[PDB]
UniProtKB/Swiss-Prot annotation:
Keyword Secreted: no
Null mutant phenotype: Essential, it cannot be deleted.
Oligomer and partners: Homodimer, required for active site formation.
Keywords linked to the UniProt accession: ATP-binding, Cell membrane, Membrane, Nucleotide-binding, Nucleotidyltransferase, Transferase, Transmembrane, Transmembrane helix
Cofactor: Co(2+)
The EC number(s) this enzyme carries: 2.7.7.85
Cofactor note: Optimal activity at 0.5-1 mM CoCl(2), also functions with Mn(2+), for a construct missing residues 1-80.
Binding-site residues, ATP: 71, 88, 101-104, 122-124
Organism taxonomic ancestry: Bacteria, Bacillati, Bacillota, Bacilli, Bacillales
UniProt topology in membrane: Multi-pass membrane protein
Recorded superkingdom: Bacteria
Residues of the full protein shown: 101 to 255 of 273
Localization annotation: Cell membrane
Organism encoding this protein: Listeria monocytogenes serovar 1/2a (strain ATCC BAA-679 / EGD-e)
Protein name, as recorded: Diadenylate cyclase
Substrates-to-products reaction catalysed: 2 ATP = 3',3'-c-di-AMP + 2 diphosphate
Gene name for this UniProt entry: dacA
Length: 155
């Protein structure tokens, strides 16, 4: 019961790590929000429902540019990719650097009103960023991404 969950959470982390590394190298923009205690059903409803098993391959295929599923956020809920091409609210923060794009503003926006963990791949730089509780972790290393995902997603 609780042991099966740990396997699922590590698979989720690995799937995020592999897919964002693939997308970062190719400068494919991506926006992946993982729901936690705060429901995100209201934003899942804005996307295209997938209700799919989590995998690095499916995450990569979702974000391929100019495809039906890429234009918005993936939302992960429990052990599923719930929706793709979903809306996330844009932060009104003037503290967010003007160098960062809409993906970053939307990740910051959802992090201000939920406890989700949101991962961004920049299509401009390939840098990977994370938002949590209204804060931005900009351009994190693979080691840093791993430690944060471990701390925040393995419970």
């Amino acid at each position: 019961y609780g042991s099966r969950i740990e396997r699922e959470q590590h698979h989720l982390i690995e799937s995020i790590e592999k897919s964002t590394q693939y997308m970062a190298k190719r400068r494919i923009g991506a926006l992946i929000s993982v729901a936690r205690d705060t429901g995100m059903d209201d934003y899942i409803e804005t996307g295209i429902p997938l209700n799919a098993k989590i995998s690095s391959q499916l995450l990569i295929n979702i974000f391929i540019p100019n495809t039906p599923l890429h234009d918005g956020a993936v939302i992960i809920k429990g052990n599923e990719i719930a929706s793709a091409a979903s809306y996330l609210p844009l932060s009104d923060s003037p503290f967010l650097s003007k160098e960062l794009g809409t993906r970053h503003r939307a990740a910051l926006g959802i992090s201000e009103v939920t406890d989700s963990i949101t991962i961004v791949v920049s299509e401009e730089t390939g840098g990977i960023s994370l938002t949590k509780g209204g804060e931005l972790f900009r351009d994190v290393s693979e080691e840093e991404l791993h430690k944060i995902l471990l701390k925040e997603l393995v419970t």
